[PDB]
Copies of this chain bind each other. A is one copy, B any other.
Amino acid sequence: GANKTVVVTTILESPYVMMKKNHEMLEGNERYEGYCVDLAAEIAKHCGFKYKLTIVGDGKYGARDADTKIWNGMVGELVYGKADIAIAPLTITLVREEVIDFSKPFMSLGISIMIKKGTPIESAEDLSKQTEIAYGTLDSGSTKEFFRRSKIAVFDKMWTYMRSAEPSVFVRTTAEGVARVRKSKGKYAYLLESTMNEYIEQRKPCDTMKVGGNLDSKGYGIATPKGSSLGNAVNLAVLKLNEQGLLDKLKNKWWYDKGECGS
């Protein structure tokens, strides 16, 4: 049949996808800006398709309910045919790979520790051995699931701590986690993807930093429904953009070129 406009699912998460300041004056894809907005346009240009950016209805990345077996988030939108492609900071994981297709990574990263400057923590092991400095994750997504599923002693101990700590150490959004670090006088450390930690470190008021090495290594991938014809071309586009240096330029654009915390 004739070509159709490709439905892209994504999520509002700075600096990946944001509504422009003047969005009310604008329409369609032009209402949005960010790393993933630019990436979507580059992929579409390379693959020769028209597309529509849509925002995932339930605000989630993607997980399967153990009782109903239903997939939520952007993964669910692909699984159930509501979107054709997901372009977002979506981690490639085994359980997702079983149900959707993923490109090779467009960004390599790991779980990391964000502290308020001056907090006496240098590693996950440091956090695990104490409780005075509380620590936690988003309440949904691959960072939380890493701890929940880990059989590594330090990370299992951290998960047991997080489930039992009071008040709750979980946050609903990145913005809430960052604000909690900033307002807690050194008594909250936030576990988050290194990409995001690096971005926030270059935002005013310049009071956070990434400490220690990453806890894992992984990647974000562009996702399509399993077996979708679009997957091959999208994957080749990711590889081409990487090989041309354009993914590095895009990260610099959104993370560092207008960083707010000096040079």
Contacts and interface: CB of A to CB of B under 8 A. Distances in A.
Copies of this protein chain in the complex: 2
A104 interface: yes
Most buried by B among A151, A236, A240, A242: A242
Interface in A101-148: 102, 104-105, 108, 146
Interface in A206-235: 216-219, 221, 235
A239 interface: yes
A184 interface: no
Interface residues of A, number: 28
A149 B244 CA distance: 9
Nearest to A218: B242
A219 B105 contact: yes
A240 to B, nearest CB: 5
A58 B201 CA distance: 48
Nearest to A236: B94
Nearest to A239: B94
Contact of A236 (B98, B108, B239): B98
A94 B218 contact: no
B108 A239 contact: no
B217 A248 contact: yes
Contacts of A146: 243
Contact of A93 (B93, B94, B235, B243): B243
Interface of A: 92-94, 97-98, 102, 104-105, 108, 146, 149, 151-152, 216-219, 221, 235-236, 239-240, 242-245, 247-248
